[PDB]
RNA sequence: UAAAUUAUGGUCAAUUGUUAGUAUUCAUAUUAAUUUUUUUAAAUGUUUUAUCAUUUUAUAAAGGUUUAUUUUUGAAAGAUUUUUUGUAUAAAAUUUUAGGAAUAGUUAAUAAUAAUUUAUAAUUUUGAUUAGAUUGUUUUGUUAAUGCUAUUAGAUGGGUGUGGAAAAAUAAAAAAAA
């Protein structure tokens, strides 16, 4: 248990959550771009079990 | 318990015998019944006084009164014949 | 403190505390048991608390009306004594 | 050992909120304009824009602008199953929705199947009716859910469904429905219109 | 900024508001100093205040002293109804004609049947009260207020020959209303508090004219000064507003 | 209760009193302003800030201090709240409904309650503007409300205001009404900064007469 | 805790720390929630002694002008159903809204219907619960209920008009609280009673030869407890009892 | 209700709480030490005197022979001695009417002067703490239980008032002739 | 302070209690209430390793490359159903099982029927949110064999500790309405053979005996010998 | 404007320098101190709880203040089926520098007013305000003695204002709900 505690620099080692605040909190600021764009058509190819089951429907 | 105990406390004789610690408190109030040896309003300690001097709080206050009747001459002989020695009453 | 003994009901979560106090039966009749003998204790303090109460008045009652005696005596005096002053005035 | 005193009064009760301390400072003007930035990063305004006084979760028309301007995967529907997937998150996925799927909606959506690709779907949907929604399922349901599996002839799933029917909850199944699985009878159905039995395969003994 | 954080005037608790009520429930909310704004202020006058049986009876007739002619009173009055008048015409129904103007010793009700003996003794009662006492010069400045804002009035200033009127008057009250039962509005071993009305509004008039004098009005005579005046003159009147164009006088005497 | 009959009655005995002679006000002191204490208390009328040992002739009461119940919608960071606030008059006796209308638009020192027409009543049934507090009875004691015009519509999403936790604020209502004054983005020192009380006070259940659980 | 004497800390204009006032919406279930249980309250009056504005022979009338210093607050019983004119009608089918007026129906007369029924100016309400059947408690002749006919054409309807978003106080209910005594026991002993000839008294307790059956052995329970609820000072169910009385939680 | 809690001397309740009687001395070389029996706060600052309601006595932990007395052939008497004094007025009214509560230690001092009964922490670790079953408990208090009034007056005359007028002081205080 | 444990007795800061009332210490704080609570942390905790080898999906992944064989996710719903009643089963699992969503069934919680402990809840109604698993449940309380006046808010419907009874019996359609169930001291006569109190108030059960061996086997009076 | 006695009462005031014509508290004395000496302090992990939360745990950091620092019970004590009360924030005294001049969000009335309400305003030579030094009204030393000469330490503004009360960011030696 305290161990766990340990890490947080509450100062009176109260048994209490305190996180930290570090200087780059948010993305933007640590340097990482928006979330790039998904390309639509190439995760909606079929996968290999939907392709082969279209081969053991044909026959 | 409460009940074992007060049969057995009872039941022994060096009990029923007054416990001043247990049975009372002397004195409830915050100041003291009399003057014990404080200071004075001169600042003389209590060894320097003695209580019931000019310092203590007053006292206070046609025909013949009742005061009158008890009194008696000394010529005239006396209530019951009480043999005062001579020299005393000198 | 209370007591968290090694088999009450132990929480898994990293989030927090190792141990919640939750009891096995026997811990709660163990207990009861114990909580039973302090009371037993305890009767006869808190019996002791008023006794003494009572006490504490009747000697304030006792003591505080033989004050009120002597006093009214003190101070009807002083108050004869000043009304004197003033007919001599 | 509780954050009363550490963090001012309206923070109170605050949990799952990521490193909460941010939303002390976000009075100071260099967290403020971080935040622009940050909501900025976030996308889907017109305007340099920044969350109210004491808020530390985002307002509720915001997010759900968010989530409506978040682009729905599959931009290519072909099969009328797709088509009414689409629909399906749209009506019962939408931001804090009230309303609930109900067994019907599911049997439509289950008719729809064609290629194995869409049962896969279709299942998913029903995955989501059983754990996620938790609907009661009616008789005509494994009806329905067993059609659809002969209809790509994929039989493994039905008795599947039938070994354990109880997660799934599939709280009837006709006798005959698990004969059908388990072999003994040849066929699951007769349809009464047809007067043949189903599947066809086996209704060449009725010939 | 400019003052105290919170201004001492502010600071107000109701205790007519039940305990605990502006801590949790709800909070009270009102204008607190129209209420704590005092009698210097609002300029009201106690006055002997009426027995409810006595309160019922409208009083018949009143002692008054008689301002002579030529008073620094009346002119000053008179300037003042000029002024008053240029301000607001409406005042005009309210206002006393200089003519009535008359110091008001003590108000009482006669019934109509015993009428002439009271007046006869009473009127002797009077002359022997006020033999001793030689003219009275007395100072009036500032207004007041009787009957929550409806009679406005010229008070007489404890300043001056006033103390000797306190004895006559407190005289004449321990004679007529202690002697010979008489209502006097008030108690007999209370003093009546002495003045010159100058604006009123009566039962009928209320309606049309409200049912307090507006403080807009005589705001700024309220401490104006009307002047000195010596009186000889002491009258018993019963009011009657038509008999000679000044209160009906049903005694008199004069202090010489 | 029983005191209110008991002081009535005896006001009305004592006004049927043949013989008395009359108060003397040398013996019937006023009230005082001075007294030790920093705060300034008001009081009763019968009652004084001295110790007065006896009991004083009954008066009626010219001046009834009226108590009128308003709700107002307080902004608490959480979102809003429906709370209470009573204005008090000095309604003078004989005063008509109408007069304390106006008597009360008058005293309320907040932006928020007189805006539109409101209308008194007690115990939900409205009082004639037309007639006099002495026909229905209304003493210090009486509870009397009152009824704004949208009030009735304040079940819906529309007339009760809308908190920037769940609602678009914008550039339309930015410059309008209590959003323009409260100042919904964040200054340096906070802007006039409301009182708060979180989410989880009351429970998942907000606060009721009733136990709900 | 106690209420604490007077608020000098904060301005009173701004009111600061205020217990919300509660205000009954008439859309939700919450509703019912208050208004019930005193129906229920009501209608055992009405069917012991006699309250006087509880039964109209007819719908009150009242002008436009009138209509809101007449009508809040009054509650008035009729015989069959007719719905009072200019209201618009809804029906309550919401199964939570339903659910309060359980022990009114069940333990007195059986609830057919519930109507919201608001005004077309849309300030004022009527609340309106339509009863089938007789009573499931015993009618006194003298009661109030015995002048109707659709108790003892078996439906009957109560009404109740009110302001909405007001505080449950002014929605009348706490008049009622009166308590008459069922006088149904005791019908059996009066002289009108001809069963009271086939009473028989108990003076004597009678001889007993055999204690009471005991009850079954006690099985500890096995699963985990959240300690003494006496020393967490939860009453005996977390129900009702006062702390002190452990009885009847786990040991 | 400190935001960064004084970690050392925690307590329970507001500071300051209901008061409490402890003992406590400056810490020094045992050969000179002694001890404060102190009614005061539950929250003490820096220095003891800030809460302080009274004070009840000194205690000497050192057991002493006793020179004050003559030299006593009798064997119990020339036991040490341990000294202790006790202000007994202030400790009934503190802790009966202000309803103090009790440090251990001076609970056992105030224990051996026979004002308290010995405390809970006091222990024979010869006896076990006993057991109880509620049916064995109440066949003892169907055995014996006394009866309702004789109770009822018990708990009057331990509790609520103890002096009583017997009819004699009655008659003693009741007016004579003149005035009767 | 309305309601002491024991009186006012302060010999000991235990001997209050772990809370002085019921009744919430300070105002400003009304959660402070005491309730009868229940071990959230553990009771919610559900098991991972059962989501071993499963290969779920998301909601918002409707992707073509994404989703999986039929049998794949067939083995997936069954291993999140067992995820989801792998601790217990919560009110609203139970419910939508049972006949008219269980309107009318007794749900009692596992601790409230052993020992001296005897209560369920009648269920009134609910509301099922868009997720199940969660939403609100009322119903009347019966507290051995005594019943509450009015239907309550369930507490604690969300915690997995539920089991129940189907009855037809007790089955009520959404038209009509769910009567609260009689207490037994009031509405139905009193009857030994239909129901026996558990306990009473001023009841409490006899020592079990495996608790005094293992407590005088710990206090040192009968011995133990490794 | 008279003595006094039924006699020592009412409980201890007692000063110690060997100088250098004379005038003036002034070198070398005793007591008390600093010079002067490890026999009284002490180490870090406060603690429960219903779980990412919520209950318990309120005056030793610095800055330099002389017309200056002032307060409740709603927490706990605390007893009991539910409501119940009123008293408080204000002042008066004591206030330093060898050679001495002006100070200022400013007084009082109004009022839950007025960054422009009204007024012949307020503090000061009976010593102000700035500025130096300084921790304020039972604590010591010397002495026969009115004196002279010490006394630490601890309350340093506001800015989502929680809490009964701000006393709230190492530095105990206060047992903190078995
Ligand atoms: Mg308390
Ligand atoms: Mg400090
Ligand atoms: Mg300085
Ligand atoms: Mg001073
Ligand atoms: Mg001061
Ligand atoms: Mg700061």
Redesign the interface.
Known sequence: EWLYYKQFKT????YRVIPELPEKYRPHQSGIDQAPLPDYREINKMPQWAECEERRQSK | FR?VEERRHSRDVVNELP?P??DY????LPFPDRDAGYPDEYGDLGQWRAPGGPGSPVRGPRGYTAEWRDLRNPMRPPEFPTPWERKYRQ | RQIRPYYNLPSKSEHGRKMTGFLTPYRHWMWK??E???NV?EA??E?????????????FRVNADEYIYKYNITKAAQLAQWECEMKEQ | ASLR??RPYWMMFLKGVDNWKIYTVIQQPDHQRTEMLYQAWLGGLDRPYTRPKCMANQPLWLSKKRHMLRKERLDGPETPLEKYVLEWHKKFHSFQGTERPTPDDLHTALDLVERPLDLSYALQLLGQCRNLNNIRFAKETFLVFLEACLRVGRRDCAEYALEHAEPLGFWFIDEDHRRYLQGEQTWYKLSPLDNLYYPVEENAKLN | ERGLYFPINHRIVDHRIAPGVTVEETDVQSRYRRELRTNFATGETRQTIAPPWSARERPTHFFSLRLPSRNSVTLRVKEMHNHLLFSHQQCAPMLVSPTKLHITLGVMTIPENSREELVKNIQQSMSETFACVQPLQLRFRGLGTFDFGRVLFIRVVPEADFGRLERAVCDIRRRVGGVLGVDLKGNPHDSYVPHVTVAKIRPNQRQQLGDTIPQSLWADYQHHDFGDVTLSTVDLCRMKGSPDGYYHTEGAVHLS | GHYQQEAFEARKRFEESTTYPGPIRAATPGDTRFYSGSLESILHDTDRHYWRAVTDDPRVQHLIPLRIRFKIFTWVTSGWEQRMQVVQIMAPKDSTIAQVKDLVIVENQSPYLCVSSFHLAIDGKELDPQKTLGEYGITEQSQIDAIEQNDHLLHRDDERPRDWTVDEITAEDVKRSPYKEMEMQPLQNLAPRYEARPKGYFGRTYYSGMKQS | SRRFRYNTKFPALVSYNKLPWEVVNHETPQFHMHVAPHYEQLLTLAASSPVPHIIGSKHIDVPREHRLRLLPGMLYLLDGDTLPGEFTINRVLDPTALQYYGRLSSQIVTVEAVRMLVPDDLRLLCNCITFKGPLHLPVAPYASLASLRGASSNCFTLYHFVRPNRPPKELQLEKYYIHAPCVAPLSEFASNSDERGNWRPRLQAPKRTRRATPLPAYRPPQSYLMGLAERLAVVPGGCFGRRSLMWGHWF | ???????RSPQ?WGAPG?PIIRMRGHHVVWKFQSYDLVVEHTHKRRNSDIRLLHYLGKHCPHPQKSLWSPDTPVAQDRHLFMLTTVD??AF??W???K????SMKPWALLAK?????PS?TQNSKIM????????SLMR?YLA?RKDEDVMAREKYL??????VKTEEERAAERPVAPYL | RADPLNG?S????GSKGSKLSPEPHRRRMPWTAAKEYVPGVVLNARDKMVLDGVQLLDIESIDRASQLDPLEVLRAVVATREYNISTGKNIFQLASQATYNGRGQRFYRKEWQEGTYDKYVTLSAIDFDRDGNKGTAYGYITFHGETTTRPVQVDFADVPGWYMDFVEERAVPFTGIVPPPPSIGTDVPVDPHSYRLKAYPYY?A??PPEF?ER??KD???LPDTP
């Open positions: 100062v009176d080692y109260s | 009940d416990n610690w247990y408190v002397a004195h409830a | 048991q114990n039973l003998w302090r204790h006869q303090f019996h002791l608390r008023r006794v003494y109460k009572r006490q504490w008045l009747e000697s | 005193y550490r | 209700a400190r935001a960064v809690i004084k970690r329970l209901a007994i007025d009934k009214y802790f009966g009417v309803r103090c509560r009790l002067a026979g004002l308290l009964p809970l076990p703490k006993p057991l109880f079953d509620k049916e003892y014996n331990n509790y609520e008032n103890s002096m | 006012g302060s010999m000991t800061l409490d006899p020592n005094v407590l005088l206090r040192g009076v």
